[PDB]
Design an enzyme around this catalytic site. Structure first.
Site, mmCIF file in Angstrom:
data_model
loop_
_atom_site.group_PDB
_atom_site.id
_atom_site.type_symbol
_atom_site.label_atom_id
_atom_site.label_comp_id
_atom_site.label_asym_id
_atom_site.label_seq_id
_atom_site.Cartn_x
_atom_site.Cartn_y
_atom_site.Cartn_z
ATOM 1 N N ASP A 39 -7.196 -0.859 4.461
ATOM 2 C CA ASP A 39 -8.237 -0.179 5.387
ATOM 3 C C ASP A 39 -9.015 -1.103 6.030
ATOM 4 O O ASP A 39 -9.795 -2.012 5.744
ATOM 5 C CB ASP A 39 -9.240 0.656 4.621
ATOM 6 N N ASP A 225 -8.812 0.474 13.022
ATOM 7 C CA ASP A 225 -9.001 1.007 11.718
ATOM 8 C C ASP A 225 -7.710 1.298 11.297
ATOM 9 O O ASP A 225 -7.259 2.589 11.491
ATOM 10 C CB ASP A 225 -10.183 1.946 12.025
HETATM 11 C C1 LIG Z 1 -18.335 2.675 5.213
HETATM 12 O O1 LIG Z 1 -17.518 2.500 6.279
HETATM 13 C C2 LIG Z 1 -17.183 3.282 7.232
HETATM 14 C C3 LIG Z 1 -18.174 4.629 7.281
HETATM 15 C C4 LIG Z 1 -17.762 5.455 8.336
HETATM 16 C C5 LIG Z 1 -16.770 5.564 9.067
HETATM 17 C C6 LIG Z 1 -16.074 4.214 9.272
HETATM 18 C C7 LIG Z 1 -14.867 3.969 10.009
HETATM 19 N N1 LIG Z 1 -13.522 3.708 9.263
HETATM 20 C C8 LIG Z 1 -13.083 4.986 8.584
HETATM 21 C C9 LIG Z 1 -11.974 4.496 7.330
HETATM 22 O O2 LIG Z 1 -12.783 3.208 6.495
HETATM 23 C C10 LIG Z 1 -11.824 5.508 6.437
HETATM 24 C C11 LIG Z 1 -11.064 5.176 5.069
HETATM 25 C C12 LIG Z 1 -10.413 6.259 4.262
HETATM 26 C C13 LIG Z 1 -10.970 7.518 4.122
HETATM 27 C C14 LIG Z 1 -10.373 8.356 3.067
HETATM 28 C C15 LIG Z 1 -9.295 8.277 2.376
HETATM 29 C C16 LIG Z 1 -8.544 7.132 2.725
HETATM 30 C C17 LIG Z 1 -9.115 6.068 3.444
HETATM 31 N N2 LIG Z 1 -10.941 6.543 7.023
HETATM 32 C C18 LIG Z 1 -11.392 7.792 7.368
HETATM 33 O O3 LIG Z 1 -12.517 8.082 7.353
HETATM 34 C C19 LIG Z 1 -10.510 8.772 7.990
HETATM 35 C C20 LIG Z 1 -9.100 8.938 7.241
HETATM 36 C C21 LIG Z 1 -8.298 9.897 7.626
HETATM 37 C C22 LIG Z 1 -6.891 9.633 6.930
HETATM 38 O O4 LIG Z 1 -6.467 10.971 6.786
HETATM 39 N N3 LIG Z 1 -6.576 8.577 6.299
HETATM 40 C C23 LIG Z 1 -5.188 8.766 5.779
HETATM 41 C C24 LIG Z 1 -5.527 7.673 4.396
HETATM 42 C C25 LIG Z 1 -4.145 7.762 6.384
HETATM 43 C C26 LIG Z 1 -2.913 8.318 6.678
HETATM 44 C C27 LIG Z 1 -1.986 7.475 7.626
HETATM 45 C C28 LIG Z 1 -2.266 6.476 8.129
HETATM 46 C C29 LIG Z 1 -3.520 5.811 7.579
HETATM 47 C C30 LIG Z 1 -4.386 6.616 7.035
HETATM 48 C C31 LIG Z 1 -8.542 10.722 8.743
HETATM 49 C C32 LIG Z 1 -9.523 10.508 9.708
HETATM 50 N N4 LIG Z 1 -9.921 11.129 10.465
HETATM 51 C C33 LIG Z 1 -11.176 11.724 10.828
HETATM 52 S S1 LIG Z 1 -8.577 11.741 11.511
HETATM 53 C C34 LIG Z 1 -8.318 13.438 11.001
HETATM 54 O O5 LIG Z 1 -9.423 11.736 12.779
HETATM 55 O O6 LIG Z 1 -7.632 10.634 11.757
HETATM 56 C C35 LIG Z 1 -10.616 9.555 9.056
HETATM 57 C C36 LIG Z 1 -16.181 3.405 8.145
#
Ligand SMILES: COc1cccc(CNC[C@@H](O)[C@H](Cc2ccccc2)NC(=O)c2cc(C(=O)N[C@H](C)c3ccccc3)cc(N(C)S(C)(=O)=O)c2)c1
Lengths: 383, 9
Positions: A39, A225
């Site tokens: 991530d 990201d």
């Molecule tokens: C504290 O750090 C923060 C706080 C808020 C936002 C951010 C920005 N970065 C967000 C990422 O760190 C996080 C990490 C994460 C969350 C949940 C499961 C696995 C990983 N990702 C998300 O929040 C996040 C994860 C996904 C998601 O489904 N990820 C899966 C694991 C994935 C699938 C395929 C390829 C890569 C990842 C979707 C979305 N969306 C909103 S979308 C539907 O628009 O694609 C957001 C960071």
């Protein structure tokens, strides 16, 4: 394991289509093996440490003679999902990465919500961004900082994420592997070290400029990201892009539910009409004054295959550009096109065409430049 | 055959 040379790290990532790329890691003594989601969007290293119906295994502290409790709890909410648990430190390795062991901060997840994913086959997350966005605050050193401080490993890594129900890819920790890309590497600056923040300076859809004030593209930031599925775009930019895509592909008749990712579009297997859909180009700030370069993705990146929801006679897809109110997120939709070098040592992100991106016989993803941007407007959002 | 068609998620 063994020499830790680049050849040994190629292909060290696996996943299920649409559920995240992970690498294998070992934590504790004796080693306990877990698949960890890679991530670049966050900065905490955290593993399941309690039974959860989606987890097939988890980290057991009591089993590790090298575990140390930091006696401080921690809570992380993301855009999708949240978790809480206990901070501690332990010995950590990467069997198909460098040949090193590091004492790193670990969050033992004890409760979570909408975080783990059923069948994704991973049990933790590796936050590779910078300290500034680590919880509970920036004094919790992220894993990559620990690895560089404690070992000799060069302060960079690179990611090749390969699209489609198994996916794969590579994380090269410490350098760049020439067989994962073709063409040249183009670099954009890391604007600030927190997220891997960049600046988008022009967007085109089928060669037609979106024609917005470039500050809108980075309102209130733009990040790269690997933990986010979609290309996420700020509301105003989301709306214009859909309009522009709808027009270029005459899909004005598609239900608006498809466009908000609430429904799949299904075609006869083998017949997806790739070519009615437009390429999308982001111009990213260059390394010299008034220079930029673009990255270009195909519909093969922004329309994602979804399986086991309909007959194998049929390919079905989700529109994977979506709206955000916290800035642009260049997620997997973008990263699946390119080899992406996170050159922390020189505060820059490199893009080259991926040896493994999904394309057709008519069109490929591209990385092209230099372009002289006559506009000397500052595209970063400031206030 | 009828194509394309749409499925909810
Ligand atoms: C504290 O750090 C923060 C706080 C808020 C936002 C951010 C920005 N970065 C967000 C990422 O760190 C996080 C990490 C994460 C969350 C949940 C499961 C696995 C990983 N990702 C998300 O929040 C996040 C994860 C996904 C998601 O489904 N990820 C899966 C694991 C994935 C699938 C395929 C390829 C890569 C990842 C979707 C979305 N969306 C909103 S979308 C539907 O628009 O694609 C957001 C960071």
């Amino acid at each position: 394991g063994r020499r830790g040379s680049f050849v040994e790290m190629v292909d060290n990532l696996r996943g299920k289509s649409g559920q995240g790329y992970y690498v294998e890691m070992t934590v504790g003594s004796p080693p306990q093996t877990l698949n960890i989601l890679v991530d670049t969007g966050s900065s905490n290293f955290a593993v399941g440490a309690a039974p959860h119906p989606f987890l097939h295994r988890y980290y057991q502290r009591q089993l590790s003679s090298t575990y140390r409790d930091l006696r401080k709890g921690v809570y992380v909410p993301y855009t999708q999902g949240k978790w809480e648990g206990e901070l501690g430190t332990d010995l950590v390795s990467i069997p198909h990465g460098p040949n090193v062991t590091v004492r790193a901060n670990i969050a033992a997840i004890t409760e979570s919500d909408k975080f783990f994913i059923n069948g994704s086959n991973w049990e933790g997350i590796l936050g590779l961004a910078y300290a500034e966005i680590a919880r509970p605050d920036d004094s919790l050193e992220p894993f990559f900082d620990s690895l560089v401080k404690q070992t000799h490993v060069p302060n960079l890594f690179s990611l090749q994420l390969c699209g489609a129900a198994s996916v794969g890819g590579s994380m090269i920790i410490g350098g760049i592997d020439h067989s994962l890309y073709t063409g040249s590497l183009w670099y954009t600056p890391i604007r600030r070290e927190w997220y891997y923040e960049v600046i988008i300076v022009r967007v085109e859809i089928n060669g037609q400029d979106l024609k917005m004030d470039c500050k809108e593209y980075n309102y209130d930031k733009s990040i790269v990201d690997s933990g986010t599925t979609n290309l996420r775009l700020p509301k105003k930019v989301f709306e214009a892009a859909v309009a522009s895509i709808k027009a270029a592909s005459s899909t004005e008749k598609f239900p608006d539910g498809f466009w908000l990712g609430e429904q799949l579009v299904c075609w006869q297997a083998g017949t997806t009409p790739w070519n009615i859909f437009p390429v999308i180009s982001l111009y990213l700030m260059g390394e010299v004054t008034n220079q930029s370069f673009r990255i270009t993705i195909l519909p093969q990146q922004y329309l994602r295959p979804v399986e086991d929801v309909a007959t194998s006679q049929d390919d079905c897809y989700k529109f994977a550009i979506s709206q955000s109110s916290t800035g642009t997120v260049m997620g997997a939709v973008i990263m699946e096109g390119f080899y992406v070098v996170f050159d922390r040592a020189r505060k820059r992100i490199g893009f080259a065409v991926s040896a493994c991106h999904v394309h057709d016989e008519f069109r490929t993803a591209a990385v092209e430049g230099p372009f002289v941007t006559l506009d000397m407007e500052d595209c970063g959002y400031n206030i | 055959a009828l194509y394309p068609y749409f499925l909810p998620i």
